Write a protein that binds this DNA or RNA. Sequence first.
RNA 1: GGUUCGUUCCAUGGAAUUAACGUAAACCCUUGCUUUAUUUGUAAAUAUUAUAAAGCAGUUCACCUUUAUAUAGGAAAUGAU
Lengths: 177, 179, 112, 46, 188, 178, 438
Amino acid sequence: RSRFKNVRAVEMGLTSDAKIESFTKKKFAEYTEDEKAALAHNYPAEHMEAIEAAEAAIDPKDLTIQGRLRVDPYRMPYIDDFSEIQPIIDKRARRSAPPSHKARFMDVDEFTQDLINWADEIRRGTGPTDGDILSYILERSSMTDNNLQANSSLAPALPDKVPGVEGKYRNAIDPAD
Amino acid sequence: DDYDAPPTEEEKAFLRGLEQGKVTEYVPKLTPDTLLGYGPPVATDAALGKVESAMRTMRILGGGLPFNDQSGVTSDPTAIKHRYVHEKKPVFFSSVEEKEWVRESLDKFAVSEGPEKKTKQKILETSVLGKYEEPKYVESLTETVKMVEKYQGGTFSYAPSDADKFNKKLNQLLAAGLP
Amino acid sequence: SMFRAKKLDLGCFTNVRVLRDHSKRKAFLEAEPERQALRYVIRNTTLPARTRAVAQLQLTQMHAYTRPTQIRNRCILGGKSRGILRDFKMTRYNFRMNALMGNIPGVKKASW
Amino acid sequence: IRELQKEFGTLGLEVDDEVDDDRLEHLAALRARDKGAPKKKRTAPS
Amino acid sequence: EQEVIMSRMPRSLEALYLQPLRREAEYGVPSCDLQLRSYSIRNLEFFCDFALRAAYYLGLPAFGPVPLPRMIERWTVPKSHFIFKKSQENFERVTLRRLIQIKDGHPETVQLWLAFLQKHAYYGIGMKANVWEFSKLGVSKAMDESKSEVEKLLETRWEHLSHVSDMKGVGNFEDFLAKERLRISGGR
Amino acid sequence: EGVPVPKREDDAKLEFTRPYNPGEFLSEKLRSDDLQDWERERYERALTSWEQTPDDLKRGWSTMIRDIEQAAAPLRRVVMPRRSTFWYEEEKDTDLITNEDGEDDFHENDIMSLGHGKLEEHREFREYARIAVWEMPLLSKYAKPFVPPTSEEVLRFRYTTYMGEFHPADRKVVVEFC
Amino acid sequence: SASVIFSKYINNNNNKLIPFKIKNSDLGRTRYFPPISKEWKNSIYVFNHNNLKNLPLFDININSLIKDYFNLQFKDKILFKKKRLSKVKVVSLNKIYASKAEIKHTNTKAILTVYTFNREKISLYKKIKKLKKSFYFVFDKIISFSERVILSGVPVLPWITESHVNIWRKIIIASLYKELILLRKYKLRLDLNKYKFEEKLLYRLNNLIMKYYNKKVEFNIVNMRSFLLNSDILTKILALKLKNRNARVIKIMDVILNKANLPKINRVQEKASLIKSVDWNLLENKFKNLNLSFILNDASYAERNNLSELLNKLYYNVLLVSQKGVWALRSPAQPKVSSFAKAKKYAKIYQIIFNSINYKNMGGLRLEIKGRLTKRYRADRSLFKVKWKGGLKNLDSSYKGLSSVNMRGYAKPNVEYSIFTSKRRIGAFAVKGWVSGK
RNA sequence: GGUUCGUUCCAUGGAAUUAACGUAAACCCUUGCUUUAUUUGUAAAUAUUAUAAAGCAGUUCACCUUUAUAUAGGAAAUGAU
Ligand SMILES: [K+]
Ligand SMILES: [Mg+2]
Ligand SMILES: [Mg+2]
Ligand SMILES: [Mg+2]
């Protein structure tokens, strides 16, 4: 006897060990050599290492004898690879460099040089566009830290129109007033 | 005339990237070295359990903070310099990247690379080798001093300094009740 | 008076008696091993009578602050000493108000 | 707050101690109507 | 430059929508008793599932989650800060817990399982583990032969700790550890 | 000591009190007041080069700074607070005063704080699904099969861990042999 | 052979075999399990409780510390602001408001959550945006006009050292001093407001708060679009308003309430109950025998043996196109991502995640003011005012009948209660506030 | 004017139509059942005590009686459960 009962495997017609193998190879066939190449050409190197190991760890015989469907309240409501980090539905990424301790807020002299440096970087790629001027008030650091873009701890914002919230409100205020 | 133009479509799309975020990369990485420091400090026969108990002792000397190798590299330079210099106590860095951030944050501050030789033996002596001082068996009940050391050596509540405070007053009393 | 720290170190609710019970917990921490050697020599009936009489007289000369029975838990938010809960360092009341707001983790109103 | 005003005081940032600043305003108001504290006596009563 | 019709998805992703697979123990001798605790169930119940998924990849056959008897503390406090004692109300603190037992698990492998769980611990859960290991006679010798083996593994770990020459603030080393472990623990 | 007095001696001396052009600025700078001799040569070559250009070139400069002054004119204008204002009713900082035009309107782009606790709980379920799809499989490369103890392994020690927590009971070692 | 002790733990095998039973009874959907972090401020469990008895007291210290951190402002001398040295107490409202922190404790770190309403950025951004676009364009011409007059001969190069740049940099400032101080003034004030949420300044606050929990603290600051979505920020805004002696108490409540927009509702349908019927679309009712050995064994469908295909018929797959189709992978520094990360469309995923969140829309509001809020400086009886807009009930349970999960056994999951205490020149007063979610 | 444990519900009024709180609902413990889990609990075991997560369940059906025909109630160890 094993840890599990064969009651569920004997009714379908998998009483024998050789019968369970015909089901695994038919239902849980391993990836073909062609699929691996295509799968290794789309995903990066590191992501492929975890895939090849999972197909060796998770043997197909386990999925047949004891594999069941997940119905718990913690199952993910959708299917996704979770390969990258998405804007809203994922925690904000932190890939910046640590801040400088000796950094200080620029002065009128240092501020001018930074403003001059910004005017020469955009004049090397009329004049400054609205996107460059808008990327200077929100991304140009005014600290003596070599224009560091520190990782923000601000939680990711929500979509422009949240599902379940949009389409239900009317603005009582009137511009004519 | 005080009118402000509504946010343009270009500007809206730009703010989204900052607020909502962008599609960054993610690289899986998991090796025993990335798990070293979070393991259980157990005195097993497996070297992994003993290497973790030594890492734990370095954290008690460093201040006792947990081994957090995923919450950044910042720290307190003004306080680590005082502890490392004005108090002359050790300092524990969860990673080398955190060690170089305090260097680039202080004006001419030098942090020793590694501990000294003796400090490495004192850690392996008790945390890894586990060398104790067997409490001897006292037969006669009149052996006051010997009997006290027996009890003080069989419990971690009495520290080396507390036992000395005890033995100081005890020996003072025994000597004051003689002819 | 001699045990009161010249520089206040208490970070909780400060009081006249909270500042007095804190000075006793520190004075007892320093003299506990010494005070436990006098109580051991007094109870050891194997030592000479004079040895036990000298320890009995020296224990009586210890300052009151050194005595551990003088220590009494006090609320870290109100400073009272009556009806204090050891698990929260607060009065029965301050525990209630904080438990309802959600400041005490785990505590919930009980119904059964 | 006094240890926060010194950590950010090197960057030129300021912050009002709403508690202490309020305690000082209450004392100043009393001196306006002659209700403050008396001169601390530092000698035996005689 | 063509399209390949994938027959199925990676097994790693398909295993996330099935119940946590479990390995079969040949002998059934416990090698670890991990007991999780929390004041809520949605994080405890969830982490218990995540733990079983890690014990399958490591070959550790896990058994559980076994729901242990919940611990209930009770306090009855007066609703008023004064004379009004005739009106009281009951409070409590229910501790919900589980138990994941690992049988026939390699000692070192179990420590990886436990290390992986602490790094990715779910907020609001307290974990306690008891590890069982077999050993031969003569522990004194064994613990002495493995001094050099541990020195080679710590060669690249000594960088964490750094101190001035002839540390004077520590004084008595063994006494420093004892009283510095109390401060961190909170007194005992 | 004594009753506290106000601290009114707080001010930042502006470098220049009025806009100076290259000529006037260099002239005042090169008044032989206090500077290195060699350093005074740099300014001199600059001033000499400044007084070598056509008048029109100099004229344009004078108008260029006046075109910048008008570009930053609406940024130093004291906006008058609205009659029925809510935020700037007692705001003594003229700078922050805006028009209060559509500043408190709901654009249907946010949920309540209670909803952010369930959304932040999903951002964590993905963080744990990303670990169980990409990082857990790598744990199988370092696992070792269990081997039953031989006839010489007669002891069964027990060690307790609290997973990164200091508990005084984490020092006991139980041993049981037959 | 085997050890005698290794055999005494094998014989103790009375385990119960997993039955894999077949469900014959219909199952209803589970309740809405609210977040755990909203029940208690500290979501923690420690095996040694000596690290748990101070948390209620630290909270006050932390909240007061974080409150003062979001109020940090430059010294007027640093920005050449010509401070007005008045003896009055300015009551400023255009600052960053914060809520009571909510900490998620672990043995390794602590995640400190705080909801803010950045009211300073709303003004600084719009004002600095008034600066014409020609300013930067005309300023770029001065950099080219000064590199042909001062750093040239007759009307970056190897014969131009950095010594000449120092003097060349002052002339521009000599003629644009009063202009650069203005731009720099708003640029710094915006960056300060921006760095309070980034690591450039949070690493300094982490140290001060790290001395209480003895752990590295991670922040999850959340930005709110309107201040009416959090009771902590709302009761603090109304409190600062009433601190003035001339504040019209009753009229300030009407302005705040009028700024609260409630969604349209069908009264008859909102209060209508739900009948209990078996939902045969539930994953538990669809397949009553969850064993894959029975679902994939040609039960009803044909040639769907593949497990992946089955999952696609139950969950929305993002990788595939057309919701149901097939996965087509292309055949044979830069970021390490997939070759289809851009093709993935999270249009319906956003609609699945935000529909499973309850109490999103604000449906209730209640403001209570009680205390000494008179004008004249004399002894006068207390004042009490109450206003509300919408209901604070739990509609899912009060009308429909669905089971809810009360917080701490007595509180409704959808209501946020907060109290703020202040004082006038004549006495103390409080401001309570309830905000509810539909 | 009837009805209901209840401003519950129906009808009706030459003035009504509605909202919030309380009520109600829901929740916690408890009861039967279904599924999950089997240690530190259980003699054995193919699992039935215990432990505890979620879900279902009632006045529902049957019988009898019933106004203005609109709203319903009774019976209680010998209908089911
Ligand atoms: K000892
Ligand atoms: Mg009527
Ligand atoms: Mg057992
Ligand atoms: Mg049962």
